[PDB]
Amino acid sequence: NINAFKEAVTKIDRVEINRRLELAYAYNASIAGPYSAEQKQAGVVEYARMLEVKEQIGHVIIPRINQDIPIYAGSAEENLQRGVGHLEGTSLPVGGESTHAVLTAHRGLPTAKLFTNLDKVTVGDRFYIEHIGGKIAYQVDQIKVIAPDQLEDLYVIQGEDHVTLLTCTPYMINSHRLLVRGKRIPYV
């Protein structure tokens, strides 16, 4: 599955990756606000389309917790049951200045690890998004537990490239959301 996305990515043309990535970037620009309103909007359409079809965005590798979880567009349960749901209204995890991808995954499901261990992720820890365009790396710069009412941490920090691995916390209780935010680092 982390293969059936790797295989599905290789299997698709650079041009198509770019168009989708660029739809991702435009999606991100419109999230964040380089891209025209129309491409922004197309980016929104593509996200929405990715949303509609619960498209796999890729997968987030979190070395710390040995998680390599498929990311799907949308925080729909049907994604959250399968792996990481990219949070709607959130930058697609394609990196970029002023992208903030929020990748939500359950802090565990029955048998299913998912983000159950996100709490072990430690500032400085890295995690990576493999999206259709490749792997990008984040280093957690901020682990935050916030009430689930709090959105502010999930918005694009302009200038910044973040991906917050978002889960519910405390484990099991899920009162709060654990935001493990990675700041884009160079992928090595």
Which residues are the active-site residues?
106, 168
Q: How far is CA 58 from CA 8, 41, 92, in A?
A: 10, 22, 10
φ/ψ of residue 145, rounded to 5: -110, 135
Q: From the CB of residue 34, how many other CB atoms can be counted at a distance below 10 Å?
A: 13
